[PDB]
């Protein structure tokens, strides 16, 4: 099959390029072009492209390790409960734990997650996509969602579209 959320979850930070391809299925994946030395794996048709993952590595070397995981429409929120009111309760400067308790522990999926000093977590950057009860779709247009981004575990900004 194509790239999936289960495959994305099975792939871990620190795995090699070939470990990524073992799990993802190299028939789904590419490198080069617009993706540089990252590995980009397509899932099902969605929107004007495909659900996908992009994996970044510590270097171009054949045995470099995953230091970056990004995905679009591979993961559904486990219990979306975000509202406009909860979004307005989030404040720049909050820690990740404070944000998740505010928006709901099941409301978000990880959009991008990057460790520039991998295996160290210093400088980690994180983008969460968070959804109201029916805002997520694995194929079509979001119906109520937010982008929350962090550096070193501290919320640096927030944006939302169509929350109520």
């Amino acid at each position: 099959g194509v790239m999936t959320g289960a495959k994305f979850t099975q792939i871990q930070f620190g795995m090699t390029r070939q470990q990524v391809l073992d799990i993802a299925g190299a028939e789904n994946c590419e490198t080069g072009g617009s993706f540089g030395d990252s590995i980009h794996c397509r899932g099902h048709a969605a929107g004007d492209y495909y659900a996908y993952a992009t994996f970044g590595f510590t270097s171009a070397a054949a045995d470099a390790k995953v230091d970056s995981k990004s995905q679009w429409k591979l993961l559904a929120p486990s219990a979306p409960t975000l509202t406009l009111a909860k979004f307005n309760q989030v404040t720049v400067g909050m820690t990740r734990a404070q944000v998740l308790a505010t928006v709901g522990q099941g409301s978000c999926t990880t959009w991008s997650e990057y460790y520039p000093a991998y295996p160290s977590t210093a400088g980690v950057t994180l983008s969460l996509s968070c959804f109201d009860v029916d805002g997520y779709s694995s194929t079509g247009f979001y119906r109520g969602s937010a982008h929350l981004w962090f550096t070193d575990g501290v919320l640096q900004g927030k944006r939302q579209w169509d929350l109520v």
Partner: protein, 261 residues
């Protein structure tokens, strides 16, 4: 009339609203279906934003090499190329290619911002003689596609004439026209839309769009085997807010209007 009846029955079976405009440049003939009604363009508007930047480059010929910063505050739901360059830069060439070949939403917003905002993209359309096109919003909200909402809409007739002028005519300088065609031909997405209704030997440069209400769009320049090129716009939208895409309807419309070529 036979082609009209087939498009009407396709629309009826599909449950939605279909708009089609074909231009055959061999004889300047057209096949039109709801071609003066408005449809939400969704990502098909990325062609106009890219073309507006190309037009600007005619007065600033190093423009496509100029760098643009990408920040987390720029991200807008779908951006597979720009997210690789957060806290870095992309050139306007890279942003144009990402918008046209991956439908990257950050790339679209940088092209819009570069020319001065949505009203400036609309002004570019007016300068080409297109009085119908309107770009009102940025990504991602330009895709809401609410029935009755004229924001971010055009008509099939207007978009087919404008795409002709851009890709085959003189709306752009020669090198800019070649660059636009190169980008659209190099876009290998869209194989399930207009291209799926055409013979495999035909060369297609297209841009799809998708949005709310199951909106499913494609605009294309088409080089049939041994024939003058075609321009084809196919727009489709559905009554249900959460309707799923129907790329196959666009393929079906493309087959109907090119049959016999």
């Amino acid at each position: 009339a036979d082609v009209q009846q087939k498009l009407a029955e396709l629309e009826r079976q599909s449950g939605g609203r279909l708009g089609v405009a074909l231009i055959n440049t061999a004889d300047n003939s057209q096949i039109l279906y709801r071609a003066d009604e408005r449809f939400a363009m969704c990502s098909t508007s990325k062609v106009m934003a890219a073309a507006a930047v190309l037009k600007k480059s005619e007065s600033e010929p190093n423009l496509l090499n100029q760098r643009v910063e990408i920040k987390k505050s720029d991200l807008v739901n779908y951006n597979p190329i720009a997210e690789k360059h957060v806290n870095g830069t992309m050139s306007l060439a890279e942003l144009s290619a990402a918008a046209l070949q991956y439908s990257d939403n950050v790339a679209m917003n940088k092209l819009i911002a570069h020319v001065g905002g949505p009203a400036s993209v609309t002004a570019f359309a007016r300068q080409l003689g297109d009085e119908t096109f309107r770009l009102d919003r940025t990504e991602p909200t330009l895709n809401t596609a609410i029935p009755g909402d004229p924001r971010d809409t055009t008509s099939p007739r207007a978009m087919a004439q404008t795409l002709r002028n851009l890709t085959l005519g003189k709306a752009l300088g020669d090198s800019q026209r070649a660059q636009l065609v190169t980008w659209m031909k190099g876009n290998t997405t869209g194989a399930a839309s207009i291209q799926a209704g055409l013979p495999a030997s035909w060369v297609v440069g297209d841009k799809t769009g998708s949005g709310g209400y199951g909106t499913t769009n494609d605009i294309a320049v088409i080089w049939p085997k041994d024939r003058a090129p075609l321009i084809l716009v196919t727009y489709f939208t559905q009554p249900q807010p959460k309707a799923e895409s129907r790329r196959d309807v666009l393929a079906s419309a493309a087959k109907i209007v090119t049959d016999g070529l």
